[PDB]
PDB file of C-alpha atoms in Angstrom:
ATOM      1  CA  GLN A  25      -0.066  -0.069  -0.062  1.00 20.47           C
ATOM      2  CA  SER A  26       2.293   2.752   1.425  1.00 20.08           C
ATOM      3  CA  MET A  27       5.542   1.917  -0.969  1.00 18.61           C
ATOM      4  CA  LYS A  28       9.207   2.813  -0.831  1.00 17.28           C
ATOM      5  CA  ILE A  29       9.723   3.689  -4.249  1.00 17.68           C
ATOM      6  CA  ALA A  30      12.998   4.616  -6.076  1.00 21.97           C
ATOM      7  CA  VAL A  31      12.690   7.249  -8.596  1.00 21.05           C
ATOM      8  CA  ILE A  32      15.163   7.238 -11.431  1.00 21.84           C
ATOM      9  CA  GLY A  33      14.536   9.934 -13.806  1.00 19.53           C
ATOM     10  CA  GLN A  34      14.951  13.605 -14.887  1.00 15.26           C
ATOM     11  CA  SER A  35      13.305  16.953 -15.802  1.00 18.32           C
ATOM     12  CA  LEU A  36       9.927  18.639 -15.062  1.00 20.85           C
ATOM     13  CA  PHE A  37       8.180  15.292 -16.086  1.00 20.45           C
ATOM     14  CA  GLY A  38      10.450  13.453 -13.333  1.00 18.05           C
ATOM     15  CA  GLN A  39       9.784  16.361 -10.818  1.00 14.60           C
ATOM     16  CA  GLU A  40       6.122  16.082 -11.172  1.00 17.85           C
ATOM     17  CA  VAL A  41       5.946  12.124 -11.021  1.00 21.75           C
ATOM     18  CA  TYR A  42       7.910  12.907  -7.468  1.00 21.40           C
ATOM     19  CA  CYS A  43       5.665  15.444  -6.053  1.00 20.57           C
ATOM     20  CA  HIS A  44       2.368  13.277  -6.819  1.00 22.98           C
ATOM     21  CA  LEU A  45       4.065   9.973  -5.480  1.00 24.41           C
ATOM     22  CA  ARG A  46       4.880  11.904  -2.216  1.00 28.17           C
ATOM     23  CA  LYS A  47       1.361  13.552  -2.194  1.00 29.55           C
ATOM     24  CA  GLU A  48      -0.368  10.190  -2.327  1.00 31.84           C
ATOM     25  CA  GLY A  49       1.425   9.124   0.611  1.00 32.75           C
ATOM     26  CA  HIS A  50       4.197   6.786  -0.911  1.00 34.15           C
ATOM     27  CA  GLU A  51       8.033   7.467   0.555  1.00 33.64           C
ATOM     28  CA  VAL A  52      10.350   8.373  -2.028  1.00 33.86           C
ATOM     29  CA  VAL A  53      13.641   6.430  -0.767  1.00 37.04           C
ATOM     30  CA  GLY A  54      15.702   8.105  -3.324  1.00 35.43           C
ATOM     31  CA  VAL A  55      16.290   9.981  -6.651  1.00 36.35           C
ATOM     32  CA  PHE A  56      18.662   8.994  -9.336  1.00 35.70           C
ATOM     33  CA  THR A  57      18.749  11.775 -12.136  1.00 34.83           C
ATOM     34  CA  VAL A  58      21.447  13.367 -14.472  1.00 32.65           C
ATOM     35  CA  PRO A  59      24.546  15.552 -13.649  1.00 30.98           C
ATOM     36  CA  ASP A  60      24.137  19.513 -13.431  1.00 30.49           C
ATOM     37  CA  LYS A  61      24.366  20.534 -17.463  1.00 27.18           C
ATOM     38  CA  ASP A  62      25.666  23.106 -17.563  1.00 25.61           C
ATOM     39  CA  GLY A  63      25.249  25.331 -14.166  1.00 26.65           C
ATOM     40  CA  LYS A  64      21.645  24.136 -14.460  1.00 25.99           C
ATOM     41  CA  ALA A  65      20.772  21.493 -12.131  1.00 30.62           C
ATOM     42  CA  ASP A  66      18.031  19.133 -13.092  1.00 32.48           C
ATOM     43  CA  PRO A  67      14.420  20.175 -11.268  1.00 34.12           C
ATOM     44  CA  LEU A  68      13.831  16.592 -10.149  1.00 35.72           C
ATOM     45  CA  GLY A  69      17.084  16.717  -8.143  1.00 40.39           C
ATOM     46  CA  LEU A  70      16.512  20.033  -6.867  1.00 42.95           C
ATOM     47  CA  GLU A  71      12.951  19.466  -5.642  1.00 44.03           C
ATOM     48  CA  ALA A  72      14.014  16.312  -3.831  1.00 41.41           C
ATOM     49  CA  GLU A  73      17.106  18.135  -2.251  1.00 36.43           C
ATOM     50  CA  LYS A  74      14.466  20.711  -0.810  1.00 38.42           C
ATOM     51  CA  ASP A  75      12.687  17.629   0.676  1.00 37.76           C
ATOM     52  CA  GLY A  76      16.213  15.885   2.008  1.00 37.17           C
ATOM     53  CA  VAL A  77      15.462  12.922  -0.181  1.00 37.43           C
ATOM     54  CA  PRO A  78      18.658  11.304  -1.327  1.00 35.98           C
ATOM     55  CA  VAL A  79      19.508  12.268  -4.752  1.00 35.87           C
ATOM     56  CA  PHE A  80      22.304  10.751  -6.884  1.00 35.33           C
ATOM     57  CA  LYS A  81      23.561  12.031 -10.234  1.00 35.30           C
ATOM     58  CA  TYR A  82      24.867   9.919 -13.422  1.00 37.45           C
ATOM     59  CA  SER A  83      25.449  10.022 -16.950  1.00 37.04           C
ATOM     60  CA  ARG A  84      27.017   6.515 -17.207  1.00 36.28           C
ATOM     61  CA  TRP A  85      25.561   3.397 -14.845  1.00 37.17           C
ATOM     62  CA  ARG A  86      28.100   1.006 -15.981  1.00 39.62           C
ATOM     63  CA  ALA A  87      31.666  -0.187 -15.996  1.00 39.56           C
ATOM     64  CA  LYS A  88      33.760  -3.360 -16.753  1.00 40.23           C
ATOM     65  CA  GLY A  89      30.417  -4.907 -18.115  1.00 36.06           C
ATOM     66  CA  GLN A  90      28.525  -4.553 -14.643  1.00 38.30           C
ATOM     67  CA  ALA A  91      26.389  -1.718 -13.102  1.00 35.77           C
ATOM     68  CA  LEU A  92      28.495   0.890 -11.191  1.00 38.75           C
ATOM     69  CA  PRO A  93      29.345  -0.668  -7.654  1.00 41.93           C
ATOM     70  CA  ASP A  94      28.989   2.909  -6.576  1.00 43.23           C
ATOM     71  CA  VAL A  95      25.460   3.243  -7.840  1.00 44.02           C
ATOM     72  CA  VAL A  96      24.378  -0.445  -6.661  1.00 43.28           C
ATOM     73  CA  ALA A  97      25.382   0.406  -2.900  1.00 43.13           C
ATOM     74  CA  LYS A  98      23.711   3.524  -2.875  1.00 43.09           C
ATOM     75  CA  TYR A  99      20.735   2.097  -4.303  1.00 41.41           C
ATOM     76  CA  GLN A 100      20.817  -1.134  -2.195  1.00 45.10           C
ATOM     77  CA  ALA A 101      20.787   1.399   0.989  1.00 43.97           C
ATOM     78  CA  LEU A 102      17.491   2.603   0.193  1.00 44.51           C
ATOM     79  CA  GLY A 103      15.354  -0.315   0.654  1.00 46.26           C
ATOM     80  CA  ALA A 104      12.962   0.566  -2.436  1.00 47.23           C
ATOM     81  CA  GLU A 105       9.897  -1.840  -3.027  1.00 44.72           C
ATOM     82  CA  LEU A 106       9.253  -0.231  -6.643  1.00 44.77           C
ATOM     83  CA  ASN A 107      11.292   1.394  -9.158  1.00 46.63           C
ATOM     84  CA  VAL A 108       9.364   4.291 -11.135  1.00 47.66           C
ATOM     85  CA  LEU A 109      11.300   5.612 -14.419  1.00 49.72           C
ATOM     86  CA  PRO A 110       9.306   8.267 -15.426  1.00 49.83           C
ATOM     87  CA  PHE A 111      11.433   9.972 -17.938  1.00 53.47           C
ATOM     88  CA  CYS A 112      14.562   7.919 -18.193  1.00 54.65           C
ATOM     89  CA  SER A 113      17.126   8.894 -21.404  1.00 51.24           C
ATOM     90  CA  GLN A 114      18.828   5.712 -21.379  1.00 50.83           C
ATOM     91  CA  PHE A 115      18.715   1.982 -20.363  1.00 51.32           C
ATOM     92  CA  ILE A 116      19.257   1.269 -16.798  1.00 51.57           C
ATOM     93  CA  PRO A 117      21.086  -1.810 -15.738  1.00 52.55           C
ATOM     94  CA  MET A 118      19.507  -4.721 -15.177  1.00 46.90           C
ATOM     95  CA  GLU A 119      20.765  -5.262 -11.768  1.00 47.34           C
ATOM     96  CA  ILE A 120      19.170  -2.347 -10.536  1.00 47.43           C
ATOM     97  CA  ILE A 121      15.823  -2.984 -12.680  1.00 47.63           C
ATOM     98  CA  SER A 122      15.398  -6.224 -11.076  1.00 48.04           C
ATOM     99  CA  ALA A 123      16.008  -5.578  -7.513  1.00 44.14           C
ATOM    100  CA  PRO A 124      12.804  -4.436  -5.775  1.00 38.27           C
ATOM    101  CA  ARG A 125       9.899  -6.395  -4.900  1.00 40.87           C
ATOM    102  CA  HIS A 126       7.377  -4.983  -7.082  1.00 39.88           C
ATOM    103  CA  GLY A 127       9.700  -4.439 -10.222  1.00 36.43           C
ATOM    104  CA  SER A 128      10.216  -1.646 -12.091  1.00 35.82           C
ATOM    105  CA  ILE A 129       7.736   0.393 -14.240  1.00 39.56           C
ATOM    106  CA  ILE A 130       8.799   2.807 -16.792  1.00 38.04           C
ATOM    107  CA  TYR A 131       7.366   5.507 -19.031  1.00 39.16           C
ATOM    108  CA  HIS A 132       7.817   5.329 -22.676  1.00 38.36           C
ATOM    109  CA  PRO A 133       6.427   8.091 -25.125  1.00 37.55           C
ATOM    110  CA  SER A 134       5.124   5.733 -27.898  1.00 37.52           C
ATOM    111  CA  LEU A 135       2.683   3.250 -28.455  1.00 38.46           C
ATOM    112  CA  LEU A 136       4.589   0.073 -27.766  1.00 40.55           C
ATOM    113  CA  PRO A 137       5.624  -2.000 -29.522  1.00 38.85           C
ATOM    114  CA  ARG A 138       5.917   0.867 -32.004  1.00 39.52           C
ATOM    115  CA  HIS A 139       9.233   2.706 -31.575  1.00 38.84           C
ATOM    116  CA  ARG A 140      11.116   0.737 -28.868  1.00 36.31           C
ATOM    117  CA  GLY A 141      14.303   2.712 -27.637  1.00 38.61           C
ATOM    118  CA  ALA A 142      14.947   6.255 -27.093  1.00 40.25           C
ATOM    119  CA  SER A 143      13.990   9.299 -28.642  1.00 41.08           C
ATOM    120  CA  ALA A 144      10.763   7.556 -29.433  1.00 41.03           C
ATOM    121  CA  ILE A 145       8.665  10.939 -29.916  1.00 42.42           C
ATOM    122  CA  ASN A 146      11.123  11.895 -32.673  1.00 45.89           C
ATOM    123  CA  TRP A 147      10.682   8.652 -34.410  1.00 43.88           C
ATOM    124  CA  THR A 148       6.624   8.775 -34.222  1.00 44.94           C
ATOM    125  CA  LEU A 149       6.826  11.966 -36.088  1.00 44.99           C
ATOM    126  CA  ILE A 150       9.620  11.219 -38.604  1.00 45.60           C
ATOM    127  CA  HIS A 151       7.558   8.408 -39.726  1.00 47.18           C
ATOM    128  CA  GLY A 152       4.641  10.649 -39.925  1.00 44.27           C
ATOM    129  CA  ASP A 153       2.532   8.235 -37.771  1.00 47.43           C
ATOM    130  CA  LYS A 154      -1.205   9.504 -37.602  1.00 47.59           C
ATOM    131  CA  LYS A 155      -1.746   8.074 -34.064  1.00 48.54           C
ATOM    132  CA  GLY A 156       0.866   8.468 -31.082  1.00 44.63           C
ATOM    133  CA  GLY A 157       0.636   8.125 -27.531  1.00 46.01           C
ATOM    134  CA  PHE A 158       2.509   6.717 -24.494  1.00 45.88           C
ATOM    135  CA  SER A 159       2.776   3.483 -22.516  1.00 46.47           C
ATOM    136  CA  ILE A 160       3.541   3.064 -19.069  1.00 46.04           C
ATOM    137  CA  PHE A 161       5.324  -0.880 -18.754  1.00 45.84           C
ATOM    138  CA  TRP A 162       6.878  -3.266 -16.635  1.00 45.28           C
ATOM    139  CA  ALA A 163      10.587  -3.639 -17.167  1.00 41.85           C
ATOM    140  CA  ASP A 164      11.672  -7.133 -18.269  1.00 42.71           C
ATOM    141  CA  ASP A 165      15.317  -8.181 -19.418  1.00 42.60           C
ATOM    142  CA  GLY A 166      14.406  -6.857 -23.025  1.00 47.10           C
ATOM    143  CA  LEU A 167      14.739  -3.748 -24.687  1.00 48.65           C
ATOM    144  CA  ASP A 168      11.417  -1.920 -23.960  1.00 45.95           C
ATOM    145  CA  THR A 169       9.777  -5.392 -24.417  1.00 45.55           C
ATOM    146  CA  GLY A 170       7.767  -5.741 -21.121  1.00 44.43           C
ATOM    147  CA  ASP A 171       4.268  -6.069 -20.573  1.00 44.14           C
ATOM    148  CA  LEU A 172       2.271  -3.041 -20.725  1.00 43.48           C
ATOM    149  CA  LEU A 173       0.546  -1.756 -17.448  1.00 39.65           C
ATOM    150  CA  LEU A 174      -1.390   0.880 -19.403  1.00 40.24           C
ATOM    151  CA  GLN A 175      -1.452   2.970 -23.067  1.00 42.31           C
ATOM    152  CA  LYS A 176      -3.048   6.094 -24.036  1.00 40.05           C
ATOM    153  CA  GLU A 177      -3.642   7.216 -27.571  1.00 38.27           C
ATOM    154  CA  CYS A 178      -3.582  10.532 -29.332  1.00 41.08           C
ATOM    155  CA  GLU A 179      -3.981  11.581 -32.841  1.00 41.57           C
ATOM    156  CA  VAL A 180      -1.382  13.159 -34.212  1.00 44.17           C
ATOM    157  CA  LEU A 181      -1.811  16.272 -36.725  1.00 45.54           C
ATOM    158  CA  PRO A 182       0.297  17.064 -39.552  1.00 44.90           C
ATOM    159  CA  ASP A 183       2.241  20.204 -38.288  1.00 43.93           C
ATOM    160  CA  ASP A 184       2.698  18.457 -34.687  1.00 43.29           C
ATOM    161  CA  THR A 185       6.387  18.775 -33.604  1.00 44.76           C
ATOM    162  CA  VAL A 186       8.305  16.808 -30.645  1.00 42.87           C
ATOM    163  CA  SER A 187       7.585  19.762 -28.121  1.00 45.57           C
ATOM    164  CA  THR A 188       3.913  20.497 -29.243  1.00 45.62           C
ATOM    165  CA  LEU A 189       2.920  16.598 -29.045  1.00 48.12           C
ATOM    166  CA  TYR A 190       4.963  16.480 -25.650  1.00 46.58           C
ATOM    167  CA  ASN A 191       3.512  19.567 -24.377  1.00 44.63           C
ATOM    168  CA  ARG A 192      -0.115  18.931 -25.643  1.00 46.93           C
ATOM    169  CA  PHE A 193      -0.529  15.201 -24.508  1.00 44.95           C
ATOM    170  CA  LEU A 194       2.692  13.241 -23.771  1.00 44.24           C
ATOM    171  CA  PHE A 195       3.554  15.225 -20.550  1.00 44.58           C
ATOM    172  CA  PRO A 196       0.296  16.293 -18.888  1.00 41.27           C
ATOM    173  CA  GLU A 197      -1.596  12.710 -19.575  1.00 42.44           C
ATOM    174  CA  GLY A 198       1.926  10.819 -19.034  1.00 42.18           C
ATOM    175  CA  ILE A 199       2.535  12.186 -15.551  1.00 42.73           C
ATOM    176  CA  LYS A 200      -1.361  11.411 -15.027  1.00 42.31           C
ATOM    177  CA  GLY A 201      -0.856   7.922 -16.494  1.00 46.21           C
ATOM    178  CA  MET A 202       2.315   7.133 -14.288  1.00 47.09           C
ATOM    179  CA  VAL A 203       0.462   8.132 -11.174  1.00 43.83           C
ATOM    180  CA  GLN A 204      -2.397   6.045 -12.329  1.00 44.13           C
ATOM    181  CA  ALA A 205       0.033   2.991 -12.480  1.00 43.42           C
ATOM    182  CA  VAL A 206       1.396   3.522  -9.136  1.00 42.88           C
ATOM    183  CA  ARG A 207      -2.176   3.652  -7.355  1.00 40.79           C
ATOM    184  CA  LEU A 208      -2.799   0.313  -9.151  1.00 38.65           C
ATOM    185  CA  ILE A 209       0.150  -1.093  -8.070  1.00 41.07           C
ATOM    186  CA  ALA A 210      -0.545   0.189  -4.404  1.00 40.06           C
ATOM    187  CA  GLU A 211      -4.081  -1.279  -4.698  1.00 39.69           C
ATOM    188  CA  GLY A 212      -2.585  -4.767  -5.786  1.00 37.54           C
ATOM    189  CA  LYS A 213      -4.669  -3.977  -9.013  1.00 37.24           C
ATOM    190  CA  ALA A 214      -2.053  -3.258 -11.834  1.00 36.38           C
ATOM    191  CA  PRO A 215      -2.979  -5.058 -15.175  1.00 38.72           C
ATOM    192  CA  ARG A 216      -0.220  -6.709 -17.550  1.00 36.57           C
ATOM    193  CA  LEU A 217      -0.822  -6.216 -21.156  1.00 34.40           C
ATOM    194  CA  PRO A 218       1.738  -8.266 -23.143  1.00 34.06           C
ATOM    195  CA  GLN A 219       2.956  -6.396 -26.276  1.00 33.72           C
ATOM    196  CA  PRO A 220       1.979  -7.833 -29.555  1.00 34.72           C
ATOM    197  CA  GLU A 221       4.654  -8.759 -32.089  1.00 36.50           C
ATOM    198  CA  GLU A 222       2.811  -7.013 -34.867  1.00 36.59           C
ATOM    199  CA  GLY A 223       4.144  -3.448 -35.720  1.00 36.14           C
ATOM    200  CA  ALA A 224       7.255  -3.553 -33.381  1.00 37.51           C
ATOM    201  CA  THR A 225       9.921  -1.131 -34.545  1.00 34.78           C
ATOM    202  CA  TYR A 226      13.291  -0.150 -32.828  1.00 34.86           C
ATOM    203  CA  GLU A 227      15.565   3.329 -32.961  1.00 36.69           C
ATOM    204  CA  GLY A 228      18.125   4.456 -30.649  1.00 36.83           C
ATOM    205  CA  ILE A 229      18.787   7.799 -29.483  1.00 36.89           C
ATOM    206  CA  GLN A 230      18.414  10.870 -31.700  1.00 35.91           C
ATOM    207  CA  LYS A 231      21.520  13.354 -31.094  1.00 42.04           C
ATOM    208  CA  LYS A 232      22.192  16.342 -33.181  1.00 41.51           C
ATOM    209  CA  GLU A 233      24.715  14.479 -35.542  1.00 42.93           C
ATOM    210  CA  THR A 234      22.162  12.121 -36.906  1.00 43.63           C
ATOM    211  CA  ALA A 235      19.416  14.958 -37.135  1.00 45.17           C
ATOM    212  CA  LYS A 236      21.144  16.200 -40.414  1.00 44.72           C
ATOM    213  CA  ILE A 237      18.792  16.589 -43.288  1.00 45.19           C
ATOM    214  CA  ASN A 238      18.584  13.983 -46.316  1.00 43.19           C
ATOM    215  CA  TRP A 239      17.478  16.076 -48.904  1.00 42.69           C
ATOM    216  CA  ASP A 240      16.948  13.354 -51.254  1.00 41.23           C
ATOM    217  CA  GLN A 241      13.265  12.599 -50.329  1.00 43.64           C
ATOM    218  CA  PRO A 242       9.918  14.121 -50.931  1.00 39.33           C
ATOM    219  CA  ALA A 243       8.784  17.489 -49.507  1.00 42.30           C
ATOM    220  CA  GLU A 244       6.572  15.427 -47.073  1.00 43.45           C
ATOM    221  CA  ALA A 245       9.444  13.066 -45.599  1.00 43.29           C
ATOM    222  CA  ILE A 246      11.621  16.192 -45.332  1.00 44.60           C
ATOM    223  CA  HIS A 247       8.815  18.108 -43.367  1.00 45.82           C
ATOM    224  CA  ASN A 248       8.226  14.912 -40.810  1.00 45.33           C
ATOM    225  CA  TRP A 249      12.026  14.952 -40.567  1.00 41.85           C
ATOM    226  CA  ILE A 250      12.111  18.749 -39.388  1.00 40.63           C
ATOM    227  CA  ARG A 251       9.268  18.607 -37.159  1.00 43.42           C
ATOM    228  CA  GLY A 252      10.274  15.082 -35.806  1.00 44.50           C
ATOM    229  CA  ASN A 253      13.458  16.722 -34.513  1.00 42.14           C
ATOM    230  CA  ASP A 254      11.741  19.974 -33.331  1.00 42.16           C
ATOM    231  CA  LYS A 255      12.843  21.512 -31.086  1.00 40.86           C
ATOM    232  CA  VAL A 256      15.327  18.779 -29.660  1.00 37.08           C
ATOM    233  CA  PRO A 257      17.941  17.873 -31.265  1.00 33.58           C
ATOM    234  CA  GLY A 258      16.878  20.349 -34.107  1.00 31.65           C
ATOM    235  CA  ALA A 259      17.045  18.996 -37.786  1.00 33.10           C
ATOM    236  CA  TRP A 260      20.246  20.839 -39.482  1.00 33.73           C
ATOM    237  CA  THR A 261      22.148  21.529 -43.065  1.00 33.00           C
ATOM    238  CA  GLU A 262      24.954  23.350 -43.954  1.00 32.83           C
ATOM    239  CA  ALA A 263      24.149  26.329 -45.931  1.00 32.02           C
ATOM    240  CA  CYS A 264      26.085  29.917 -46.743  1.00 32.26           C
ATOM    241  CA  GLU A 265      28.910  28.300 -44.841  1.00 31.16           C
ATOM    242  CA  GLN A 266      27.479  27.509 -41.571  1.00 32.67           C
ATOM    243  CA  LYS A 267      25.402  25.036 -39.984  1.00 32.70           C
ATOM    244  CA  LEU A 268      21.754  26.048 -39.986  1.00 28.97           C
ATOM    245  CA  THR A 269      19.099  24.263 -37.977  1.00 27.93           C
ATOM    246  CA  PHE A 270      15.559  24.380 -39.314  1.00 25.46           C
ATOM    247  CA  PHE A 271      12.072  24.707 -36.922  1.00 21.20           C
ATOM    248  CA  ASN A 272       8.514  25.401 -37.280  1.00 23.54           C
ATOM    249  CA  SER A 273       7.670  23.677 -40.849  1.00 20.44           C
ATOM    250  CA  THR A 274       4.466  22.979 -42.709  1.00 17.96           C
ATOM    251  CA  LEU A 275       3.310  21.635 -45.677  1.00 20.88           C
ATOM    252  CA  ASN A 276       0.753  24.176 -45.970  1.00 22.67           C
ATOM    253  CA  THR A 277       2.133  26.665 -48.794  1.00 25.48           C
ATOM    254  CA  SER A 278      -1.155  27.571 -50.504  1.00 20.85           C
ATOM    255  CA  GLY A 279      -0.571  31.012 -52.362  1.00 23.26           C
ATOM    256  CA  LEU A 280       3.137  30.564 -52.188  1.00 26.17           C
ATOM    257  CA  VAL A 281       5.568  31.512 -54.638  1.00 28.49           C
ATOM    258  CA  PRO A 282       9.240  30.860 -54.836  1.00 27.11           C
ATOM    259  CA  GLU A 283      10.413  34.366 -55.251  1.00 28.61           C
ATOM    260  CA  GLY A 284      13.032  35.934 -52.902  1.00 30.38           C
ATOM    261  CA  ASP A 285      16.610  35.533 -51.854  1.00 30.97           C
ATOM    262  CA  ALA A 286      18.157  32.219 -52.871  1.00 29.85           C
ATOM    263  CA  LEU A 287      19.712  29.940 -50.271  1.00 27.86           C
ATOM    264  CA  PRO A 288      21.754  27.522 -51.879  1.00 26.49           C
ATOM    265  CA  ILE A 289      21.832  24.168 -50.050  1.00 29.11           C
ATOM    266  CA  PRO A 290      24.518  21.856 -51.014  1.00 27.59           C
ATOM    267  CA  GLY A 291      23.082  18.589 -51.691  1.00 28.00           C
ATOM    268  CA  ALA A 292      19.643  19.713 -51.995  1.00 25.10           C
ATOM    269  CA  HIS A 293      17.566  18.956 -55.394  1.00 27.37           C
ATOM    270  CA  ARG A 294      16.963  22.899 -55.775  1.00 27.47           C
ATOM    271  CA  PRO A 295      18.095  25.942 -53.898  1.00 28.37           C
ATOM    272  CA  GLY A 296      15.840  27.224 -50.911  1.00 28.13           C
ATOM    273  CA  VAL A 297      14.204  30.705 -51.110  1.00 30.33           C
ATOM    274  CA  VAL A 298      14.175  33.024 -48.314  1.00 30.47           C
ATOM    275  CA  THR A 299      10.382  34.852 -48.482  1.00 29.31           C
ATOM    276  CA  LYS A 300       8.141  37.034 -46.417  1.00 31.14           C
ATOM    277  CA  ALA A 301       6.633  33.769 -45.618  1.00 27.28           C
ATOM    278  CA  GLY A 302       9.704  31.874 -44.399  1.00 25.30           C
ATOM    279  CA  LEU A 303      12.195  29.826 -46.153  1.00 25.34           C
ATOM    280  CA  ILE A 304      10.626  27.724 -48.819  1.00 28.90           C
ATOM    281  CA  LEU A 305      12.200  24.146 -49.370  1.00 30.14           C
ATOM    282  CA  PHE A 306      12.038  21.859 -51.998  1.00 28.95           C
ATOM    283  CA  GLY A 307      11.754  18.148 -51.773  1.00 29.84           C
ATOM    284  CA  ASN A 308      13.330  15.705 -54.712  1.00 35.11           C
ATOM    285  CA  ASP A 309       9.693  15.751 -55.938  1.00 33.16           C
ATOM    286  CA  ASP A 310       9.666  19.428 -56.633  1.00 29.65           C
ATOM    287  CA  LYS A 311       7.084  19.945 -54.041  1.00 29.58           C
ATOM    288  CA  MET A 312       7.477  22.676 -51.497  1.00 27.76           C
ATOM    289  CA  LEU A 313       7.463  22.936 -47.727  1.00 29.36           C
ATOM    290  CA  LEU A 314       8.151  26.075 -45.516  1.00 29.58           C
ATOM    291  CA  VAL A 315      10.227  26.522 -42.631  1.00 32.19           C
ATOM    292  CA  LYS A 316       9.166  29.444 -40.441  1.00 35.35           C
ATOM    293  CA  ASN A 317      12.391  29.700 -38.016  1.00 33.62           C
ATOM    294  CA  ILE A 318      16.055  29.328 -38.178  1.00 31.78           C
ATOM    295  CA  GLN A 319      18.829  28.810 -35.533  1.00 33.23           C
ATOM    296  CA  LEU A 320      22.251  29.807 -36.553  1.00 36.71           C
ATOM    297  CA  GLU A 321      25.256  28.095 -35.652  1.00 37.80           C
ATOM    298  CA  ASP A 322      25.915  30.751 -32.842  1.00 34.93           C
ATOM    299  CA  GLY A 323      22.669  29.781 -31.249  1.00 33.24           C
ATOM    300  CA  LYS A 324      20.406  32.754 -32.469  1.00 31.46           C
ATOM    301  CA  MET A 325      17.012  32.194 -33.436  1.00 29.76           C
ATOM    302  CA  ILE A 326      15.664  34.010 -36.216  1.00 29.55           C
ATOM    303  CA  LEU A 327      12.500  34.271 -38.343  1.00 28.35           C
ATOM    304  CA  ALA A 328      13.471  32.500 -41.259  1.00 31.87           C
ATOM    305  CA  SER A 329      11.969  35.434 -43.285  1.00 31.31           C
ATOM    306  CA  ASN A 330      14.646  37.538 -41.741  1.00 32.03           C
ATOM    307  CA  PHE A 331      17.710  35.622 -42.521  1.00 30.38           C
ATOM    308  CA  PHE A 332      19.600  38.016 -45.214  1.00 27.45           C
ATOM    309  CA  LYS A 333      17.968  40.878 -42.854  1.00 28.43           C
TER     310      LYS A 333
END
């Protein structure tokens, strides 16, 4: 009923799940989160520090092919009965996952078995999926193969980005879903729903490097690529001697015409055009998409229409 929980996670999502668990009467025995980065502490770590809950910060969890003995010891002192992984950027070693009585439950922002692995919201959108959602699932010895506890779906809209889909649904409903899952576990009523084999896909973490734009694709695929990396890590290309990151794409180009200032883009099927509406780009089908914002290599964010000032 009133459980000793280890929270392994990060970000405001992790903070909120932490706060709710405390409000429901559970004891958070410890929090494992990410290091400060940079000069900025993780908000879940800061909140737990306010409360005097143990807080441990790690980027890597392993050495010599095993869980870090340091982390195992710190973890074993806590006596956790359940692990909750609200927003966890990596896979946690099996030695920690399998330790508690009640097991480990994990939030994953896609409709498992679709998009197993990291960056699942990015891959949802990169593939132009028409539905998306999140799962809370029981960790097993596999990679995001564990039985579901609950799953909630939402419609994906044609210009949705990682940030808009997260803020509209996966964040607010996902927090609610994790909290509901813990309540069911506390009550001894949590479902176990084995994942079907049909439709399983896997992708790994999407770092800035692999967000580089492939121009040899139809406009619709390039639009899905840009929005599926917006805002993090940010789809990019090299143009005008710098690395430019593109945000806020749309395929609504009704009434637009390709007149303005050329933006030559090595490797693209046609040059981009800077217009009053934004940056017009062409896919390899000579169809257009429109990018409204550009982030310069130095980090400055601009309206694409203002690129040449």
